[PDB]
């Protein structure tokens, strides 16, 4: 089945550009006249005023929420009494449906299973040894050439001859010494 | 307040206006240009021309266009 | 407790110039309209009118000796709160170890809200798995999907009110026999005459039942600059 | 044990009873401590020196009083009478009745769950023992499949690697014949250009 | 082998097939998979088999292509991958017959190293 | 390192016959884009939104135990978008120790 | 506000949009400089603005590692999830972190201004002198804008650090990634500073350290002091959010977690006394030479064991969950390529192999598969993988295998020719080149344009 059918109808498609019209035709950017709404825009975005101009943290519209008895406003739990016992009633969440939009049937199934985890303590700490000490063992096959290309460049070498070389911006200097 | 509770709420409930998405691609564009302006620029002041015509630095045959 | 920084000056007492100046009134507010300086100044006033009156202590039983000093007779309900609040603060800096959490008796969870969010890590030992987070909500019994340990929120609510100190003492606690004035006075004049004052807070409460500058000195202890 | 012994806060007492510290600026008073030990007096000396309470006698009624409700307090209050209480004494009196809050399970409301639910409850921790037990064994088993076949790759990589030693070794027996044999070695043939 | 000398508490398929089946499916349309191995639609749940009527652990494995084609789908019943193949049932085969496993994966070895040696050389 | 919990044979033995390993679906169900209403204002979309977390969301067992959305980390605790302000009451931090103290019980 | 904001989460998200925005400028250096290699003759750039090319590369370098990567893999993910992952209400520093932000976009509107009102002329992202020295002012402007940079990043990292007196969970590897990356910031940028200033002494203050009887190789040690443990501080966080991916795609714990931590403290520790593998060439005893080369080798010890942590962590994942999420292909492909970055780094570590491959395009392609290719694939997956959690959209990139496929073609395409013009051999740091390396020169160019027009779909 198709599933976008289902909330199609909610879906209705949009008459202007970016969802507003042009400022001509409604001034979005003013703050809205309804009562209790004066901190939003008339397109119900955040008014300027409410969280730039005056903001609170500024020290605008001072006004301390705690109580004299250092208390304040908390709702309290769905509470049911039965067999003797008080019980309390978790909130469960909308169906998916309603917040999102598919119906919520034909579901794949995906059993419960406990975490995926590595066992046989022995062979797992030799597989990690091997994961560091086959690299020292690569490393230490080059250590012995390197030393020895090392030790090539830098040999005292009977040279006969002596070519001077220096190099400017932008030619490269050649002295070269002259046959008697 | 509900509205204060995500940062940046207008734009996650996607409500925002779209003018702050162009304001931001716009600067991005600009940063663009401060590497291709000042070279047609360096390229005219040195040469005379904004940008260069390939390989004209090198020899070329009588019927090169 | 370890998070606490040093104790105030105002955390063992209070200066006088702090006292309600109308003390008649102070005496007759009910312990529900009293706020944290009225408060403190009514168990001050009255607890030390009874301790400062040594002739009279053996003969005040413990109720009412308690009622006077402003001490809450504990009893299995507010004992259940005050301790649930102090384990509620001393999570805020500290570490949360317990026993293994089980149907019997889950992991207990305090909040104040409707959620607190909660690690899971497992047993002692071997048995101990990595930290698997969880939001734990009101009226769910949970249970984590590694180890099955049992767990549970506690909501410190009561009466769209949060747990307080102050809320278990004005639930709780009841309100005895009015004060009476006249202990004020008779106690005033057994520590404070001629010119020795031996009960300072009752020179200072008696000046305002009398109106405010009528004792001796009060006027020139009333009288500041800046 | 704390800041040197210095405590955080103490109590200062004054003869002139019209004396501010901050106001004044004379030389002659000399501050004394709670006990009323002159500032002078160093406190090596001063902390020797025995402090006991002394309440009015017409406390004593009370203090016997506590004592027999509370035969465990009695001693303290006996020092007290006597005049034998030290701020030690008090201290050990003080912390020695502090007990510590208590909580009540039973008094904590339960999440909801019916009856049906309840008895499903050993049927639950079974399917979480069963699901442990399988966990465990599947570890073992993945370890050895999976740790083995890494072993294919060891030997794919020396079979690719070892092409190209081959192809090394090929290499190094051509670069012997080039100055030996190689007709494309040419000597007495590169002749200086010269400046232009 | 982990049903056979491992666990002896999960459901053991048995093989339809140590080969493929090749399949047309479409986009958006869901179908079911054979996981016991005994129905005569294969690869398909035919209504009849284990799978369909619930019994011995035995259950439909539910699918659903992303875009239209021609999948290849597990005969073994085993593979990894199931409902799709990725070549468990050649392998599941050579734990059967592990003398025919052997001449197979010496030809494609010999292939193999042929052709490389070939190339490179 | 870590195997699983250790399992005596004891705790594996079935009070009936009949008992096999429970079926419920850990997908938590069918989701996408959240889908807010056009007439839903600023703050009405904000309650769409902390009515559409996936971390809030749970499966229930067949002893009514729920199995709560875990993560590794804590990161995947907080409401998605991320509000201004995520942990005013300190996230705790289960430790499990095999020891114990008298006041805790009552005879 | 906007400015003012001191959200930790929401100077997360100015990082990371301020990289992006300073990176478009990046890449449209790397287009000029790639079109300008297309062929053998002058393209783009007039021969008598050839200055303009050693501009181009200069701050193509400066800005993708100081302005971009760092702010992206530094100061973006680490910014909103460090103090979630701590289990803090917010940073330890809230005001120092307002102004790290606004420092950084200071110093680059001076760089970028520089580029305009000065002569434009370059001398490498690396400023060695005495050609740093003899330039113009725009490298006056530039020695200010890391100077001001490096302000940025030491507040930043004394703000991490302070973590660790307020976690109230447990450390997990990424926080270990970030507190390293910062203790290698806290010991490597005082000693930049210093040789930074010493720059600015002999171009503005008439000293001699960089003219004869001075030493010029002594500011390559101190660069190089600061430069190797840069490319660490780079990669490390990169190292952390591949850790956090891949446990949490495949739902299994991380294996090894103490030996990965033991691995990133390793690294930079080895990192912190490898840096003149940068000075082969120069003419450094025989002994030095060896001491350098065999430290250099150790470093992929410790670097080989998380490789082979993360492969047992995609391991054995269970099938039935979708691995085509970019976030996931992009984890995996980041092992794919720091693999062949690494190898390459070891090949040019032997100092005998470095004569050859010096100044050329091989160590180019070497950094690009790591940074280029790496670096920015665990920037993109980190930022994938919390994209519910951030709450961006109005992109089409959290399943797009399209993207992938292209992207991981294509950027190869530019850098593995690279590999090949460095045996034959084609220096750097140049614009014209000889006719007989055109072909690998054209097709990393058909790469370059190829992956800019990817960058495109995705939105
Ligand atoms: C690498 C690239 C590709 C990447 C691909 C991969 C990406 C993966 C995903 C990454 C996701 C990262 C996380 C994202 C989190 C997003 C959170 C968010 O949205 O936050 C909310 C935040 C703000 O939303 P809000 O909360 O509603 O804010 C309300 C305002 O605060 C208040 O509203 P207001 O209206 O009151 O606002 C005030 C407004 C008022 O504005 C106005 O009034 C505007 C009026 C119109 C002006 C328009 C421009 C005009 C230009 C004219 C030029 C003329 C040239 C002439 C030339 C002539 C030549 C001959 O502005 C101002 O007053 C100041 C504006 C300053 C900024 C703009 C600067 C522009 C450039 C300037 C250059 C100057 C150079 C000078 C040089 C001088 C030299 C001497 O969003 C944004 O800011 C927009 C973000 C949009 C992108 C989000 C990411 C989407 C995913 C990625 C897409 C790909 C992007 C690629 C990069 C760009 C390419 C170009
Ligand atoms: C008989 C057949 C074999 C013949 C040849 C045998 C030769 C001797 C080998 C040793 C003995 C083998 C004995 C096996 C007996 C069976 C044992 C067993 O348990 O059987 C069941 C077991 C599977 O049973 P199962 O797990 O139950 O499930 C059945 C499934 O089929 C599950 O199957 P699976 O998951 O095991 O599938 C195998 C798959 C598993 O692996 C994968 O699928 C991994 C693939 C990851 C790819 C990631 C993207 C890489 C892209 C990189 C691009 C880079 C571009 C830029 C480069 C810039 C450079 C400067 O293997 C591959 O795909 C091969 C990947 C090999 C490495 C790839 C890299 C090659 C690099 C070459 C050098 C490059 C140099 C330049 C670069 C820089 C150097 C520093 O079968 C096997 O173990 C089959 C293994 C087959 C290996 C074939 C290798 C062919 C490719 C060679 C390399 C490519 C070039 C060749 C010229
Ligand atoms: C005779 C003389 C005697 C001697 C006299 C001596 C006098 C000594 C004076 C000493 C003091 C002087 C300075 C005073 C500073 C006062 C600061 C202060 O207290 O302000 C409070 C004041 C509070 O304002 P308010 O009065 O409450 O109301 C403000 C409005 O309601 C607006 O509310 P809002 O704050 O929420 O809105 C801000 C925001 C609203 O947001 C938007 O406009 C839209 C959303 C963002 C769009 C996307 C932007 C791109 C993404 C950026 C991501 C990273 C952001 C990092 C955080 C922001 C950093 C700026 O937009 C902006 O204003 C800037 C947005 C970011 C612009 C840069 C983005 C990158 C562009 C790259 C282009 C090229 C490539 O701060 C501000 O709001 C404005 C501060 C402005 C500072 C400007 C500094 C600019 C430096 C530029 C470089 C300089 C060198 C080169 C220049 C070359 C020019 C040709
Ligand atoms: C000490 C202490 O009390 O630390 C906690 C204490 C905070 O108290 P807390 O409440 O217990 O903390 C809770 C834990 O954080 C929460 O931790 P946890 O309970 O989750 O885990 C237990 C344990 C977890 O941690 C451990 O147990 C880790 C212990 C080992 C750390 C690595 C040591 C170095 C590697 C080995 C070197 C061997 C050299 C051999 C030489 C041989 C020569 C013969 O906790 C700690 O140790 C926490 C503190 C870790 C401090 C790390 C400081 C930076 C380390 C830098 C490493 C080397 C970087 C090299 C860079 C390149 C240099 C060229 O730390 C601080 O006070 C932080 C101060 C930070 C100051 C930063 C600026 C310094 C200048
Ligand atoms: C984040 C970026 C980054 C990273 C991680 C590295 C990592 C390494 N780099 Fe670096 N490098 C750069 C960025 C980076 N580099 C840059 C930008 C330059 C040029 C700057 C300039 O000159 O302007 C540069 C230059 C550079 C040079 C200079 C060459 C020249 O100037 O001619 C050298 C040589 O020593 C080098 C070596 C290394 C080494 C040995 C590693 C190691 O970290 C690699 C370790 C990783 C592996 C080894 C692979 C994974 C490990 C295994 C698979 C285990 C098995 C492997 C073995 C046993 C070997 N780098
Ligand atoms: C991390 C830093 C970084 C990055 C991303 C790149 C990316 C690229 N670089 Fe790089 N490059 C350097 C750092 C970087 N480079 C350095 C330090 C040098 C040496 C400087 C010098 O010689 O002095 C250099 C040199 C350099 C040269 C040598 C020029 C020369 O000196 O002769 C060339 C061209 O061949 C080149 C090409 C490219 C191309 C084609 C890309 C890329 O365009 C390839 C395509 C990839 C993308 C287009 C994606 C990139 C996207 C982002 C970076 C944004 C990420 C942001 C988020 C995820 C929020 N670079
Ligand atoms: C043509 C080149 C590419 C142009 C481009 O993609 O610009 C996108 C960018 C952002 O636009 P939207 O993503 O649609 O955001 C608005 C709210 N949805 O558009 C602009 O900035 C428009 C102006 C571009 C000027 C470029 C010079
Ligand atoms: C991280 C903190 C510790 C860093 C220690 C680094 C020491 C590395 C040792 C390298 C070495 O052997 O030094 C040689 C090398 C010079 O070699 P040549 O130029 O060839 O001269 C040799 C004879 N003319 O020494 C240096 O450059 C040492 C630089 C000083 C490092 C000081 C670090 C200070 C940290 C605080
Ligand atoms: O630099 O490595
Ligand atoms: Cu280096
Ligand atoms: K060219
Ligand atoms: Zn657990
Ligand atoms: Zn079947
Ligand atoms: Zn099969």
Redesign the pocket.
């Known amino acids: 089945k198709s599933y976008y059918d289902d909330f199609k109808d909610r879906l209705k498609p949009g008459k202007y550009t970016?969802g507003r019209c042009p400022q001509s035709e409604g001034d979005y950017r003013q703050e809205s006249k309804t009562i209790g709404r004066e901190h939003l825009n008339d397109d119900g975005t955040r008014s300027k005023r409410y969280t730039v101009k005056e903001a609170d943290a500024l020290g605008y519209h001072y006004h301390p929420p705690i109580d004299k008895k250092g208390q304040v406003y908390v709702k309290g739990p769905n509470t049911v009494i039965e067999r003797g016992q008080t019980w309390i009633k978790g909130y469960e969440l909308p169906s998916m449906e309603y917040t999102y939009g598919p119906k919520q049937e034909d579901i794949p199934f995906y059993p419960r299973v406990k975490l995926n985890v590595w066992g046989n303590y022995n062979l797992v700490m030799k597989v990690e040894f091997l994961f560091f000490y086959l690299p020292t063992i690569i490393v230490f096959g080059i250590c012995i050439p390197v030393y020895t290309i090392n030790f090539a460049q830098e040999e005292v070498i009977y040279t006969t001859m002596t070519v001077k070389v220096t190099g400017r911006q932008w030619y490269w200097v050649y002295e070269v010494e002259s046959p008697t | 307040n509900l509205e204060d509770h995500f940062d940046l709420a207008e734009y996650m409930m996607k409500m925002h206006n779209?003018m702050s998405?162009?304001?931001?691609?716009?600067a991005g564009?600009v940063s663009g240009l401060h590497g291709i302006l000042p070279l047609l620029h360096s390229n005219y002041y040195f040469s005379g021309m904004f940008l260069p015509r390939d390989n004209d630095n090198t020899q070329l045959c009588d019927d090169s266009w | 407790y370890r998070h606490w920084h040093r104790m105030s000056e105002d955390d063992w007492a209070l200066p006088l110039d702090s006292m309600p100046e109308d003390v008649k009134t102070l005496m007759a507010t009910p312990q529900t309209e009293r706020g944290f300086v009225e408060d403190y100044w009514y168990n001050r006033i009255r607890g030390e009118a009874t301790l400062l009156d040594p002739e009279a202590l053996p003969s005040k039983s413990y109720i009412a000796l308690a009622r006077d000093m402003g001490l809450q007779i504990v009893d299995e309900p507010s004992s259940h709160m005050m301790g649930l609040i102090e384990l509620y603060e001393y999570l805020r800096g500290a570490s949360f170890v317990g026993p293994f959490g089980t149907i019997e008796n889950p992991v207990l969870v305090p909040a104040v809200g409707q959620e607190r969010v909660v690690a899971c890590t497992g047993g002692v030992g071997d048995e101990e798995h990595f930290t698997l987070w969880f939001r734990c909500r009101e009226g769910f019994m949970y249970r984590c999907g590694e180890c099955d340990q049992i767990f549970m929120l506690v909501r410190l609510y009561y009466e769209d009110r949060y747990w307080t100190q102050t809320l278990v003492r004005d639930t709780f606690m009841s309100d005895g026999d009015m004060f009476d004035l006249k202990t004020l006075e008779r106690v005033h004049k057994m520590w404070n005459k001629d010119e020795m004052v031996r009960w300072e807070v009752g020179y200072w409460a008696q000046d305002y039942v009398l109106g405010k500058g009528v004792l001796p000195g009060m006027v020139e202890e009333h009288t500041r600059v800046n | 044990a704390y800041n040197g012994g210095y405590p955080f806060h103490y109590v200062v007492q004054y003869d002139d009873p019209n004396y501010d510290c901050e106001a004044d600026f004379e030389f002659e008073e000399i501050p004394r401590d709670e006990f009323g030990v002159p500032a002078h007096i160093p406190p090596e000396l001063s902390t020797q020196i025995r402090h006991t309470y002394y309440v009015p006698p017409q406390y004593y009624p009370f203090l016997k009083k506590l004592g027999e409700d509370t035969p465990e307090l009695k001693p303290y209050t006996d020092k007290l009478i006597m005049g034998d209480m030290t701020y030690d004494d008090y201290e050990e009196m003080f912390y020695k009745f502090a007990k510590p809050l208590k909580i009540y399970r039973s008094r904590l409301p339960l999440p909801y769950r019916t009856d049906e639910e309840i008895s499903q409850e050993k049927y639950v921790n079974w399917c979480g023992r069963w699901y442990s037990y399988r966990q465990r064994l599947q570890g073992d088993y993945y370890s050895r499949h999976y740790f083995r076949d890494w072993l294919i790759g060891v030997m794919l990589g020396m079979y690719l690697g070892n092409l190209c030693v081959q192809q090394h070794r090929q290499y190094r027996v051509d670069m012997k014949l080039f100055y030996l044999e190689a007709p494309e070695h040419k000597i007495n043939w590169v002749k200086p250009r010269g400046d232009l | 082998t982990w049903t056979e000398i491992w666990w002896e508490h999960d459901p053991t398929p048995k093989v339809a097939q140590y080969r493929p089946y090749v399949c047309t499916v479409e986009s958006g349309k869901v179908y079911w998979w054979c996981a016991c191995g005994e129905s005569k639609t294969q690869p398909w749940v035919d209504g009849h088999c284990k799978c369909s009527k619930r019994e011995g652990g035995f259950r439909p494995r539910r699918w659903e292509p992303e875009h239209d084609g021609v999948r290849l789908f597990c005969g073994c019943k085993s593979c990894f991958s199931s409902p799709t193949w990725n070549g468990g049932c050649f392998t599941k085969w050579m734990q059967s017959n592990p003398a025919g496993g052997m001449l197979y994966c010496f030809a494609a070895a010999f292939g193999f190293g042929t052709l490389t040696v070939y190339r490179k050389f | 390192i870590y195997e699983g919990q250790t399992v005596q044979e004891s705790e594996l033995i079935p009070q009936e016959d009949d008992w096999v390993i429970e079926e419920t679906n850990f997908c938590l169900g069918r989701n996408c884009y959240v889908r807010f209403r056009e007439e839903d204002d600023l703050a009405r979309r904000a309650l769409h939104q902390m009515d559409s977390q996936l971390n809030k969301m749970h499966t229930r067992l067949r002893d009514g135990t729920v199995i709560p959305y875990m993560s590794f980390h804590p990161d995947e605790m907080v409401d998605r978008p991320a509000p201004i302000h995520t942990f005013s009451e300190k996230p705790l931090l289960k430790w499990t120790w095999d020891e114990t103290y008298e006041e805790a019980y009552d005879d | 506000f906007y400015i003012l904001v001191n959200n930790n989460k929401r100077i997360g998200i100015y990082y990371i949009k301020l990289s992006i925005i300073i990176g478009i400028l990046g890449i449209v250096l790397s287009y000029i400089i790639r079109v300008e290699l297309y062929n053998s003759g002058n393209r783009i750039i007039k021969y008598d603005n050839v200055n303009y090319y050693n501009m181009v590369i200069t701050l193509h370098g400066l800005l993708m590692i100081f302005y971009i990567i760092m702010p992206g893999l530094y100061g973006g993910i680490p910014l909103y999830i460090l103090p979630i992952l701590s289990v803090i209400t917010d940073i330890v520093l809230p005001r120092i972190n307002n102004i790290s932000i606004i420092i950084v976009l200071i110093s680059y509107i001076v760089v970028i201004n520089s580029i305009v009102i000065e002569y434009n002329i370059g001398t490498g992202w690396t400023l060695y002198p005495p050609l740093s020295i003899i330039g113009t002012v725009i490298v006056n402007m530039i020695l200010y804008g890391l100077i001001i940079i490096g302000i940025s990043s030491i507040i930043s990292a004394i703000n991490f650090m302070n973590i660790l007196i307020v976690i109230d969970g447990i450390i997990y590897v990424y926080i270990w990634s970030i507190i390293i990356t910062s203790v290698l910031l806290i010991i490597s940028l005082p000693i930049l500073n210093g040789i930074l200033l010493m720059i600015l002494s002999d171009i503005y203050f008439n000293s001699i350290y960089f003219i004869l009887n001075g030493d010029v190789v002594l500011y390559q040690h101190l660069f190089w002091y600061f430069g190797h443990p840069e490319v660490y501080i780079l990669i490390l966080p990169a190292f952390g959010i591949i850790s956090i991916i891949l446990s949490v795609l495949n739902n299994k714990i991380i294996f090894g977690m103490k030996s990965m931590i033991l691995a990133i403290i390793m690294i930079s520790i080895l990192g912190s006394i490898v840096w003149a593998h940068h000075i082969y060439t120069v003419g450094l005893e025989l002994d030095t030479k060896i001491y350098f080369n065999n430290l250099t080798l150790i470093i992929s010890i410790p670097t080989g064991n998380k490789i082979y942590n993360w492969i047992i962590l995609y391991i054995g994942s269970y099938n039935i969950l979708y691995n085509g999420y970019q976030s996931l292909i992009f984890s995996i492909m980041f092992i794919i390529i720091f693999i062949i970055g690494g190898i390459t780094g070891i090949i040019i570590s032997i100092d005998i192999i470095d004569i050859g491959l010096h100044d050329t395009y091989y160590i180019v392609s070497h950094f690009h598969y790591i940074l280029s290719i790496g670096a920015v694939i665990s920037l993109l997956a980190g930022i994938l993988l919390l994209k519910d959690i951030i709450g961006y959209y109005?992109v089409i990139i959290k399943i797009n295998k399209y993207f992938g496929l292209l992207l991981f073609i294509n950027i190869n395409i530019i850098f593995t020719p690279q590999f090949i013009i460095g045996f034959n051999v084609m220096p750097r740091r140049i614009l014209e080149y000889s006719d007989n390396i055109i072909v690998w020169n054209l097709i990393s160019s058909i790469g370059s344009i190829s992956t800019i027009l990817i960058l495109?779909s995705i939105?």
Do not use: A, D, G, R
């Open positions: 970016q | 779209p998405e162009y304001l931001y691609w716009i564009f | 109005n495109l939105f």
